Ligand binder design. Structure first.
Ligand SMILES: OC[C@H]1O[C@@H](O[C@H]2[C@H](O)[C@@H](O)[C@H](O)O[C@@H]2CO)[C@H](O)[C@@H](O)[C@@H]1O
Ligand SMILES: OC[C@H]1O[C@@H](O[C@H]2[C@H](O)[C@@H](O)[C@H](O)O[C@@H]2CO)[C@H](O)[C@@H](O)[C@@H]1O
Ligand SMILES: [Mg+2]
Ligand SMILES: [Mg+2]
Lengths: 732, 733
């Protein structure tokens, strides 16, 4: 037995059931748990962990209370450090668009450095749910629609948070979320029903969670949705059979917020006692906020409705997490010394602006650039118009953790910084983020999140048209506010808000060159924009340095290299659209009536998976395979030469897709199986070599057999999912 | 069994070429020119025909059989979906009757007319559950509810097949599309279907089982994948489930070109392997692509299939023909060789009274401000819109042998009703679409949409002049039938933009505005519900549609139709359906917070819920009473309520019973329909309604597909729609 198992067995042999049950309780200071009452419960050994306490003096005060409990078992402290702690990086969907594991790893490592510097031990991150439904407000928190890329980045984020040793003072534990399938909510409505086949679940939706487990994630946060009728919180197949027995996870499972009590609303339980029994016997170790475990576990055990082994499993997992975090060696390892001077948590000197700026550059996606309008010269008169141009609150995104809006660089400020006095900027708000007062009241319902200009729409439009007439070109900064792409904010319309589209149509009618800088947390419907704007830059929500990174691209300090990781539908009525779909019996070419299509809109996404432009031109040589036949246990090489055939240095992403065109299940028309992000000076050439073996060729059949079948495979290489060249080989 | 001995004696005579010929189902067309097809019938190489539909044409094919060695008769099939020559409303409108006897009458008359023309079989009923309004084939089903669709599935089969499948006024039902076709992802026709086995078993499979249990002679296999496996190659679906579990003894028929489509699905790399997959999965009869005739001999000689695969398939064809009476008399539906010739389309061979009476029952009153409807037969009525004079649209999609020139338009029904007592003024107003690419689609293959060559603005000014000269406006608007048909999936559920511009302009005249909606799917009607004075959903109401619509508008019939599919506020809410799960964070009138399962940019819930529809009278329900608070296994419970007509006009409504199982081993729906009663009442009349419930109503498939009723609370809800109910509880012991 390891030091950890010996230590835990010796501690648990000493504990009462009250102490073991106390370890399972995860709470936050708030209405339900006032601070002084919570401190008294920590002193009594009734608390296992805290979330949403995020400064060193507040965390140290809580850890000080444990010295009063009989066994002095330390707390751990968690937070939602999703894409940054104090220095906010782009939202995950924009990080994914970097196609660069090292950039994504740097965002996670800095997030862990900052969170651990504030005394935190754990982040409820990474979010690795696959998203094919643009309506869902939580698409901003994932890495897009692709199983290969999301799985790769899931393991990258875990390793970057946890480091070489979970006891390092600058490591935090990753609690991968949301296990499982949360992003397949029916209708894109948050928390809604998820219903899907086991082959789809295993092939497409579960691999990112398994990648996090295999990267050593210490914790798993359980989702709020049903899976095929069974809430994840009560799902013994998911949490025990799959996560523990099949995948071998040895860490901690954490319920979502009030999730145990929500089993009553889901109709699995008629009271809190039965909800508690279902959750702990399914495999939920730690109970977030609703305190059902502390209220009901003793009565359940005395009635023989649960086993002692249910409590022991759950407690062992909490203690094992604390052991790996170093907290039994030193409960203050992330909290410095008792004789440390006080400091300003929010000091500018504790931020990481260089890293945020460098990361944010990599995720920006050039969607359109007519006749080389971009990059802009630093000269002339530039009108900067729209409700997002001066928005600090929106550039940091949803789930901005301890980010301070006043510390963020707006798009306006970024342009001002870039041009100094070489160009003149003219500002007009142009429109409110929405013209619908019910939507503004929603967005401002808890906090003041959206500045509502008191002027009429007409007055703002006249001011913006005067500003555009006084300029050489217009940079319109438009899209969503961050509260439009957040938990529970599902959208029925994927367009830019109507108030802003009215502004864009008015700006277009001036005849001035029109550059759109889009801020948004989900794919948008951009048909009018693709037809009418001169250039389009997707910037997602780019974080604390967003405005500087966006100016870096617009003025060509950085040659855009971002590529989409989620298909952009032409309208909400096409949902879902995603690149790794099945052919059907009647596929549409581009073209007949009797094919799988809509009749009232053009078909396919407006922008496909892997799409994104450059200020330079790239060429690919013909694809070459090392052989036409592949033996089992051997490796196939796919080679292409990439050249920079243009006039500016830049990067692109060479993507490899596979198709299995004859199989015992209908397989996708293509599936991403590799990529290379390659930065080239003008006239440079690189031989790209992909390696494929049997593991790349397997799939789950109807009975969940996971093998590769002999026969043809098609290999596609290109700079997006739509513009590829292909060669075939045969697996023997 | 005389039948199994007759069939075994015949099959003992047949070569494999003869047995394989029985499996071939073809139509006259480019791929099968008439003279080549006739030569193949004489050679024993054809088992059945589809799309040949008149007595002289069918007799001519059956006459060719006399030249083959064994003289095995053909059967003849057609798509008699909602009528043969007399067209009833589309199925989604028949469902809105909530009256199994109305649905049975439409099917009986369809079978009478089709068998009168020599047909033996219809590819009907379509019983696919539909929760996605974008799909163009929702017009062909009975809406979103498993209980109602399952009930109507069995009614349709019994009505087609009668007491005896050999009767000359019977046809065989080929229930379709097995299975799950209406769950196409994105609402895109033919697209991927992916769902859990508990959802499949509880909600989507029961209508097909109801058809099998009602004695359907045939099952038509679907075009989609189910969890990755095309239905056409799905041995689990076609053999394990349909034959071994459900005990189906009849004929399986591939869809059109479906065996060859296994190559596009990526299950086969060539036609030989596609053929092997389909016959071994359990597809008996091969529609149109001739892969069975081309490849089965080679497959069998290579040992890639078994003789038993050919024998199973041939036996099922011969057994269908036996049941249809065709071995006793191949001409039993074709009269005598010297019957005089007749006009297939004669007016005396129609059933207009039945079509008019059935079409009245499906019409749904959605809005009626301050008693505008019913109208008086007087004054000046402007009849405006591209569907007002459309014969082609009123008969719907899948209109079989219906003749548009025999149909009654909405304009003609109003003209019939008012005679000389009122003045009608007509203006087209708008084309069905202002988008030339959409008109190009709707006129592709066949010119089905009349395009007025004037500008949109000229058509609008003419309609405004007409409206200004009238006392009120009847706007006849919505979809053309080609917008809600196979492959016509929509991304927008609104009335078309050209017509919404027309409605906004008409509203601005101040004239009372009555909307008569034609459509084959739920529509997004938020502006209409706010601005029209009255709204009548007429679906596509068939050959007598215009007369049934006038009957309602002038109050000869009190509208009694109720929705069987939820109407979303917009396409971005799809899917919306009444029997959804609660979730952990429900949004409803009792749960109105930010952190719930909702959209933020639109009102939540459907605009019109399942079971919604208004009347020209008012109804009252007494309090719901249960016969006991406890139910023992093996016993039945009664739920009683009294329905009263508390208004001034006779009319019907539909009392609906829903069940909830609020604590279960799976999350169960907030409500599930478990009974209904359509009741016609005079003013001041009352009817005591007694619903019976037992354990069978309470069971569900759990995660292991155990069919279980668990002890505990059940809530019983009664009301006149799914949103306006009250509940009482009982406990199952
Ligand atoms: O709902 C707002 C509320 O959510 C709380 O739970 C979060 C949980 O912390 C997070 O990791 C997960 O991704 O989402 C759930 C909500 O679905 C959160 O702790 C609160 O701070 C927040 O106010
Ligand atoms: O695609 C139009 C074409 O469909 C043919 O097959 C029909 C089949 O007859 C019907 O029962 C089923 O519901 O739909 C398939 C098409 O999906 C039909 O036989 C042809 O008449 C028709 O032109
Ligand atoms: Mg293969
Ligand atoms: Mg129950």
């Amino acid at each position: 037995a390891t030091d950890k198992e010996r230590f835990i067995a010796s501690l648990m042999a000493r504990m009462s059931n009250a102490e073991k049950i106390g370890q399972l309780r995860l709470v936050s200071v708030g209405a339900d748990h006032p601070k002084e009452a919570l401190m008294a419960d920590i002193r009594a050994g009734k608390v296992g962990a805290i979330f949403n306490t995020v400064t060193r003096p507040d965390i140290r005060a809580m850890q000080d209370q444990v010295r009063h409990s009989r066994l002095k078992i330390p707390l751990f402290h968690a937070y939602d450090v999703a894409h940054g702690h104090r220095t906010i990086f782009p939202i995950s969907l924009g990080l994914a668009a970097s196609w660069d594991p090292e950039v994504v790893a740097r965002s996670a490592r800095i997030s862990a450095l900052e969170a651990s510097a504030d005394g935190l031990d754990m982040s409820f991150s990474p979010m690795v749910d696959i998203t094919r439904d643009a309506r869902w407000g939580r698409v901003s928190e994932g890495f897009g629609e692709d199983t290969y890329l999301t799985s790769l980045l899931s393991g990258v984020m875990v390793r970057a948070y946890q480091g070489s040793n979970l006891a390092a003072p600058d490591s935090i534990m990753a609690a991968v979320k949301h296990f499982a399938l949360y992003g397949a909510a029916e209708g894109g409505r948050d928390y809604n029903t998820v219903d899907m086949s086991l082959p789809r679940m295993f092939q497409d939706y579960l691999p990112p969670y398994k990648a996090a487990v295999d990267a050593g994630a210490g914790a798993v946060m359980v989702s709020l949705n049903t899976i095929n009728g069974v809430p994840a919180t009560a799902n013994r197949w998911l949490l025990t059979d799959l996560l523990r027995q099949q995948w071998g996870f040895k860490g901690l499972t954490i319920s979502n917020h009030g999730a145990v009590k929500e089993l009553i609303k889901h109709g699995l339980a008629g009271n809190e006692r039965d909800a508690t029994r279902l959750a702990i016997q399914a495999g939920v170790d730690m109970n977030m906020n609703d305190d059902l475990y502390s209220t009901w576990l003793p009565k359940l055990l005395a009635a023989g409705e649960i086993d002692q082994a249910d409590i022991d499993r759950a407690c062992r997992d909490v203690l094992a997490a604390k052991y790996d975090l170093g907290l039994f060696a030193d409960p203050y390892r992330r909290l410095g010394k008792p004789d440390d001077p006080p400091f300003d948590t929010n000091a500018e000197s504790r931020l990481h602006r260089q890293a945020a700026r460098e990361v944010a550059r990599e995720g920006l996606v050039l969607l359109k650039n007519r006749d080389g309008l971009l990059p802009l010269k630093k000269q002339g008169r530039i009108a900067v118009i729209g409700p997002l141009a001066k928005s600090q609150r929106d550039v940091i995104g949803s789930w901005s953790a301890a980010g301070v809006p006043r510390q963020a660089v707006t798009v306006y400020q970024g342009l001002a910084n870039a041009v100094g006095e070489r160009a003149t900027l003219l500002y007009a708000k142009g429109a409110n983020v929405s013209g619908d007062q019910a939507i503004l009241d929603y967005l401002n319902s808890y906090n003041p999140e959206v500045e509502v200009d008191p002027r009429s729409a007409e007055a703002m439009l006249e001011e913006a048209l005067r500003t555009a007439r006084d300029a050489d070109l217009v940079v319109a900064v438009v899209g969503e506010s961050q509260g439009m792409a957040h938990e529970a904010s599902s959208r029925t319309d994927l367009r830019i808000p109507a108030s802003q589209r009215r502004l864009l149509k008015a700006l277009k009618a001036t005849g001035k060159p029109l550059v759109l800088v889009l801020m948004n947390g989900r794919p948008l419907s951009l048909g009018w924009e693709q037809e009418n704007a001169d250039a389009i830059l997707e910037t997602w929500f780019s974080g604390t340095e967003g405005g500087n990174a966006i100016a870096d691209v617009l003025f060509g300090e950085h040659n855009p290299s971002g590529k989409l990781t989620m298909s952009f539908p032409r309208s909400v009525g096409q949902v879902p659209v995603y690149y790794n779909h099945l052919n059907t019996g009647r596929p549409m070419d581009h073209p007949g009536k009797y094919t799988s299509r809509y009749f009232d809109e053009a078909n396919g996404p407006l922008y496909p998976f892997g799409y994104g432009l450059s200020y330079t031109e790239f060429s690919l040589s013909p694809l070459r395979l090392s052989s036409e036949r592949l033996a089992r246990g051997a490796t196939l090489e796919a080679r292409v030469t990439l050249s920079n055939s243009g006039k500016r240095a830049g990067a692109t992403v060479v993507q490899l897709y596979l198709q299995d065109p004859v199989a015992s299940l209908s397989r996708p028309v293509k599936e991403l199986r590799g990529f290379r992000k390659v930065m080239l000076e003008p006239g440079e050439s690189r031989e790209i070599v992909f390696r494929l073996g049997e593991a790349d060729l397997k799939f789950y059949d109807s009975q969940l057999r996971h093998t590769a079948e002999p026969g043809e495979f098609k290999v596609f290489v290109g700079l997006d999912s739509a513009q590829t060249e292909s060669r075939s080989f045969t697996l023997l």
